[PDB]
Design a protein around this ligand. Structure first.
Ligand SMILES: Oc1cccc(O)c1
Ligand SMILES: Oc1cccc(O)c1
Ligand SMILES: Oc1cccc(O)c1
Ligand SMILES: Oc1cccc(O)c1
Ligand SMILES: Oc1cccc(O)c1
Ligand SMILES: Oc1cccc(O)c1
Ligand SMILES: [Cl-]
Ligand SMILES: [Cl-]
Ligand SMILES: [Zn+2]
Ligand SMILES: [Zn+2]
Lengths: 30, 21, 28, 21, 21, 28, 28, 29, 21, 21, 28, 21
């Protein structure tokens, strides 16, 4: 739903900060 | 997944780190 | 200046939207 | 990788798709 | 309007182009 | 309300990315 | 240009905030 | 749902813009 | 403070100005 | 206009208000 | 200038995340 | 301050956590 869609966008930006140069894997998969 | 666990309540730093590569 | 890091931050947001449920690796 | 491809000239959404899973 | 279409349901990028100039 | 306010904030971003040089109208 | 692409993304966010219900055109 | 957290995220971006060179304190709870 | 004031009903830019330094 | 005027120089929220309908 | 303005916007977001419950002062 | 520190080179999490209250 729209909530989780808006939330995912903040998750990806936190992952970007957290993981730094490691990078990361974003998967919305349940 | 990350959504059901991090979107329903706030994820910790260490929980986020799970997804680092 | 810190430009490619700011850029990477917009790039991951753009990928979020374009990749959808497929998701993505972000590998610098 | 992507930073090199995409941080001087704009990658279109099309080109960004290439980085998807 | 756009809020009724897209805040109440996810507008994909393709749908979102209806609102471009 | 706020839900709508944050939504629009992310719509405007998505519209900025998809619309490109053409641009967009944002009128709630 | 990416610097302009990054800048317009923040501009659009600031206009969204500034213009409230009045909305705005973004026409590069 | 993490609504306060998302909210504060936009709050601090609005404060960044409203407060310009004066800056701000963000002191949650 | 600000979360309580601003997270269900929209605060105008002018109301947010009270939280500036 | 906006890009030329506001990307070389920082526009206040005040001057951004010109671009509001 | 503009680049510091765009950067600080990111720093504020990053401080938000990092500082969590404690919060933060942004001074430019 | 932070702009001088962190807009010239990339600040780590630990560096940024210097500006937390
Ligand atoms: O649990 C969450 C959800 C969104 C952003 C974040 O940092 C944590
Ligand atoms: O090439 C780019 C760089 C940053 C964001 C974007 O959407 C495209
Ligand atoms: O339907 C929506 C709502 C908000 C942001 C977005 O990309 C799509
Ligand atoms: O009430 C709010 C919440 C988030 C951003 C904003 O400008 C106002
Ligand atoms: O002049 C500008 C450029 C980008 C965002 C902003 O708030 C102001
Ligand atoms: O040095 C920086 C600049 C901008 C965001 C950030 O997390 C770090
Ligand atoms: Cl949000
Ligand atoms: Cl930027
Ligand atoms: Zn949001
Ligand atoms: Zn940016």
């Amino acid at each position: 739903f729209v909530n989780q869609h808006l939330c995912g966008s903040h998750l990806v930006e936190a992952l970007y900060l957290v993981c730094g140069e490691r990078g990361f894997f974003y998967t919305p998969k349940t | 997944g990350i959504v059901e666990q991090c979107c329903t309540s706030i994820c910790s730093l260490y929980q986020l780190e799970n997804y680092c590569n």
